[PDB]
Design a protein around this ligand. Sequence first.
Ligand SMILES: Nc1ncnc2c1ncn2[C@@H]1O[C@H](COP(=O)(O)OP(=O)(O)OP(=O)(O)O)[C@@H](O)[C@H]1O
Ligand SMILES: Nc1ncnc2c1ncn2[C@@H]1O[C@H](COP(=O)(O)OP(=O)(O)OP(=O)(O)O)[C@@H](O)[C@H]1O
Ligand SMILES: [Mg+2]
Ligand SMILES: [Mg+2]
Length: 1164
Amino acid sequence: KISFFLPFKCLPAQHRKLLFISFVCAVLSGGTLPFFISVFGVILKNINPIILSLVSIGLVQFILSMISSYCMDVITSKILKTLKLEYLRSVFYQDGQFHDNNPGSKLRSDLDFYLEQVSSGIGTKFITIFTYASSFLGLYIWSLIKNARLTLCITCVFPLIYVCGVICNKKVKLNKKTSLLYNNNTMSIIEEALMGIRTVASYCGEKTILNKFNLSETFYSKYILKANFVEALHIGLINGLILVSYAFGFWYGTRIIINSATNQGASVISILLGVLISMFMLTIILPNITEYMKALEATNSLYEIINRKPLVENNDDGETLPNIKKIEFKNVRFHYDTRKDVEIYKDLSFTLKEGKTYAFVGESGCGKSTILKLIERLYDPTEGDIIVNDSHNLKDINLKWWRSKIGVVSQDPLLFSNSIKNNIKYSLYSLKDLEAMENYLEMKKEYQTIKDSDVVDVSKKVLIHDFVSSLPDKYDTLVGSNASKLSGGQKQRISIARAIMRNPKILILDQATSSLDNKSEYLVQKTINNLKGNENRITIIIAHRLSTIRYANTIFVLSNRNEGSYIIEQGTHDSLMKNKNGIYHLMINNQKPNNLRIIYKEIFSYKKDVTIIFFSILVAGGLYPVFALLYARYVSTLFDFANLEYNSNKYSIYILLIAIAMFISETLKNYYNNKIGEKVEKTMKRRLFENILYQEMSFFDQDKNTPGVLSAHINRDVHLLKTGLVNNIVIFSHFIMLFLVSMVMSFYFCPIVAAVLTFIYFINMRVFAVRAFKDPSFLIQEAFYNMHTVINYGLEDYFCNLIEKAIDYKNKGQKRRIIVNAALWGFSQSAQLFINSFAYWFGSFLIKRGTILVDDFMKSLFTFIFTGSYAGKLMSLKGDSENAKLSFEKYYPLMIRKSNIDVRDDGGIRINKNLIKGKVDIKDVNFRYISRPNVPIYKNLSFTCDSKKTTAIVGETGSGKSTFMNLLLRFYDLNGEILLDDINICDYNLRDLRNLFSIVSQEPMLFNMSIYENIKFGREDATLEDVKRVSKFAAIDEFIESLPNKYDTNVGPYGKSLSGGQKQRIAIARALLREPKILLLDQATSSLDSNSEKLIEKTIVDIKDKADKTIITIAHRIASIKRSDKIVVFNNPDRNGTFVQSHGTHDELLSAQDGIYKKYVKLA
Ligand SMILES: Nc1ncnc2c1ncn2[C@@H]1O[C@H](COP(=O)(O)OP(=O)(O)OP(=O)(O)O)[C@@H](O)[C@H]1O
Ligand SMILES: Nc1ncnc2c1ncn2[C@@H]1O[C@H](COP(=O)(O)OP(=O)(O)OP(=O)(O)O)[C@@H](O)[C@H]1O
Ligand SMILES: [Mg+2]
Ligand SMILES: [Mg+2]
């Protein structure tokens, strides 16, 4: 065993008393039915006071049962809050090795899988057990005092039912665990598809994903259906065993009758009829024990994750030094966990003092960013040490205080999606929390102390104050998901400002000036190298353009030329190039309302599946009241002896025949339920995702249709249907069949009372049917995608407290919807006696009149007890049925919506890839975004690229360079024209338009498949030989052939298990395999050293030496621009638009008229 009361362990003393009250106020309400029997039996056989007593005990039953339902639904939605908060707080404090093996899409699935079990095992189903177990003892203890030997045969049977459960549970968890893995698999395909929709749409790979989705769901439905078969057999078998035992009891009971009535109604019949009700209660109890025993394992598995202990603990056991000096590596080694057989470092060691600048240079696979991550203690070394100030090791200093001084600008900027000033002010929270919380909550209030004076000047210091002051909502406008609204240089400037604001002692810049022109870079560098406090700090620059590090106290050069990188040179700018003919000299010489009808229509189509369940419900529903015959026709044939033994042997065999029919009906009722529900779930899951995957780009720029929201809709609110909407109907049908059989059985005795009270039961049945700060999922996904920023700037408790205010905001009807359900639950348990009292009332008159007898009245009233007692099951699945309908109503329009720009339209000019000139002409252009329609960008653009020529485009940051590309691929429609071979782009049947282009985007992206499949994206029919051929021009087919599982190696999610230079060359290779007619490049050499850069340049100029390809490029390095044919300059003198100024300079007209190009040539 594990335990019993785990979910109720971590509670305060304010809810434990509520638990005690809810426990005690149910046993009382349960022990009134046998008390009612004991009173009614003695009072019937002998007017106002008795009716008043009956109504009074009914009322106190109502009042006692109303409280237990209110004081139980309050604990449920506090446990379900506490667990979910404790889960995702010991995920932020976990080390980095935990995040490599456990992707973010694997955690959400487990979370919202186990919480469903916990919710469906501690709700209203917890109290029905205890309130129907009291009625068991009330009738079992009564029947025991009279004759115990007749009754104590089932206690010998209790051990046998305990054995089926063990095996029938052991044969379940295997399949459930095997299905959870494929669930985790198919959840990692949705997020990666929605984040990279711009690439999927461009390469037409939105059909390859559907096949993976369908395979992963097909291997899932099989195992889940195989698992939920055993559970339909277990409960179907227990009923049969119980009825067989009852048959043995009846057989033993007839023995004393045949003895006495021969050798010398009846009380024995009464005893057996009292025993029957106990078994009828066990029929209701047992199918809720399992669902409670499923929750213990789930919450155990959750506490297993919550009580994890990582290697790098963020305790408060560290130290606090005065100041920072002399970081020092000493014989460091390191390797990663996935690739245990791939070493990186040989003998890494150096020293760094304060008040100086430093630099790192090398190839694109060495260890630079790995050092960046190794300083901040995301990871730990294996053999060396990072001793600080020659008397203290880094594994003994307080991590919070150490991170309270470092400013970071990473190789991939990661901003949140609220606003600019809040993103810039987030740097200070981790310092104010140190000021307040370590003095004497004083934290949540001092965040207002941060005034709007430092934001202004720190924005002035990065040349963004002018642009941010021109648009509406200066410091209040919001940025989209991953800051998709802004541009690259803008995000770099925002991150630099966020780093400067806190005045760090240590600063680490990792390719921060990659997407910025020469002039702004020079000005920003002049600003940073004279900032206040520069007399004592340590700045660490990493760069590929060696012009920015001309001044530096030391320059470290390192290489790996095949078992580990190492340093080869040390010296300044002047004392390094003139010394020898090393690598550095070569480098510097190189540079120089009625919607639910859609569901039922799908249910009433599997015609042979709805038939069997119907004929099984018809048999399992009414076979308890049919026993009423078996006694009557038996008791009618007691005083006709000399043939009694024949009947006695006959009716026991009839009971056996009924027992063997209970089994089949129950198990076929319980299995085909889930079989029908899963098949609705699959279709409703597929259609939504399929429709969403073909929509346009503006649909994804909206505020609410974010990637973290849609996945939750799909998974959760398509899974809810199977349970709620398809099980509740089955329950209603079972109840209806009980009622329809009981009303037939009651006419057999006396039709008057039946015709009277069926009306009342119909009315009481009608009551049950007709009675009726953003989201949490946004924040959780937004945190899981940007874990590095959140760990660097110390933002765990902030999001923790911020998600609580959304859980509470979503729960507002959580208070009103409970009292209604509690009143209904009380009315279910108290609607039985109010009717019996009225029956006695209007029966006394007719009995006194002399028209109806007492016996038939009694045994016509007694037979409705089953349908009176079964009403408690009409309240176990109400909330999940309502939530499902609400969710369906608020995701149906996504399912039905259609797109304006759809690739499936197959009508238009079909274009062949044999006769194409490749001329792109522009007549006039005017464009404006919908997110902020006051900012004009383009005004009368005019330029051309003729055919098989090379064209270069230079401009200022924010001018619209990476917007022409998007307009050219039908991401956004137009006022103006763009012509390909003198015909507009809107009339080409864009399946072929997107076939002959090939882009190299500004931020590459990869998926969790292998390299072989990522390079084959789009073009499925291709051999490994073509891949080997095309991976040679990319200058990457040496690293891959030094690696286990060369082309079968699995990259991580989004490409995090590779570097930036590799991720980019792989994208280049992917673009070259398609054999494109038009090649679009956008900063294709931003993260590459000069050697790889000139190799790819050799490939490009070789391709340019021959015809049959039209190339367009964008770059800031002046070196790779002179070899073009025409150079186009964009400008924006007054902030109203852009127009062409220069045209066709080609490095021969650099200063003829006043322009900007004459600066960009000389500044670098
Ligand atoms: N999570 C990971 N698991 C396993 N290996 C990794 C992981 N992240 C990076 N690597 C490997 O570590 C090596 C070093 O990568 P590094 O961070 O030094 O790239 P880089 O030098 O910054 O590249 P660039 O110079 O182009 O920016 C790479 O060869 C890469 O394959
Ligand atoms: N999704 C969007 N919604 C609204 N406006 C946008 C969106 N994307 C870009 N913009 C606007 O377009 C302008 C320029 O965008 P773009 O990214 O094309 O410039 P860029 O030339 O790529 O900049 P860089 O040269 O730094 O990459 C920005 O000022 C921005 O306000
Ligand atoms: Mg890097
Ligand atoms: Mg750009």
